[PDB]
A and B are shown apart, each in its own frame.
With several copies, the nearest count.
Chain A
Amino acid sequence: VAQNALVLASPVVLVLLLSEVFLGLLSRFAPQMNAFAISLTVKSGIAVLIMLLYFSPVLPDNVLRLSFQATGLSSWFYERG
């Protein structure tokens, strides 16, 4: 479930992280910006907006794909006598 967790949270954590260092390069270009305070105001709108693009066509079919089906019941059990 962890490798299903990381690839499902894959696309939204890359843009939020790349935006922070892009903001961090502007703090190196303007020293007293205090971009840590600015990072909290702007990220909650960004972190929700990019996931709206693939919320409709991508999320609900993985839910039906990941439902555990009865055919795999042989691989998890065996009777002992």
Chain B
Amino acid sequence: DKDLLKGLDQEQANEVIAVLQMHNIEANKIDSGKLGYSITVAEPDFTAAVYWIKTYQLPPRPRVEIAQMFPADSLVSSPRAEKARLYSAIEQRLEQSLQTMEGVLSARVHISYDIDAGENGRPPKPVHLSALAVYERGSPLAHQISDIKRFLKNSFADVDYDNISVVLSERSDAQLQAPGTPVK
């Protein structure tokens, strides 16, 4: 009956359904053509559904990348604007290459940006890395912590094993069953 979000995109709409089914409320996705999607719920679940909107920050923002704020369309391009677009394509490709490993569902990698070392006589600093991962359950996740450190080590110039910090976890309990319709 009552609406709570409208005008969403495709990937913003699919996130709202997947959160509410975890909390035992059933919603409906209706397409509206060029005005994006819209999401409706029933009558008694409306008070609780807004509470989960505020905590989970729906609708989700589009994910931000570092190459968005330094566009290549500018006819001038400083060297601080070239290393930042060079780092930002390496830190998405190593994460996307990490998804082809054994048992990884998601990952996110961050690289240290160094731009002001070449302008003066100062030597360049060492480079640091960090990574997250969520593993499928049933895995001995104490023995899978040394292959990500070995693969990420000599993918760069010269790192140590203290500069690499990987912290990973097992996946959550699966949500598979239907919520159930509130009858009155």
Which positions in A face B, CB cutoff 8 Å?
52-54, 56-58, 61, 64-65, 69-75
Identify which of residues 108-167 in chain B touch chain A, using a CB-to-CB cut-off of 8 Å. Answer: 119-123
Interface residues, chain B, CB within 8 Å of chain A?
75-80, 119-123
Number of A-B contacts (CB under 8 A): 31
In the A-B complex, list the 9 residue pairs whose CB atoms are closest, starting with the nearest. Answer: A72-B121, A57-B78, A54-B76, A71-B121, A75-B121, A69-B121, A71-B122, A65-B119, A53-B76
B75 in contact with A53 (CB, 8 Å):
yes
Minimal beta-carbon separation of A50 from chain B (angstroms): 10
Expressed in whole angstroms, the minimum distance between the Cβ of B7 and any Cβ of chain A is 40
A65 to B123, CA, bound (A): 14
CB pair A52–B119 under 8 Å, yes or no, is no
Contacts of B123 in A (CB 8 A): 74
B121 touches A57 (CB 8 A): no
Q: B121 contacts A74, CB within 8 Å?
A: yes
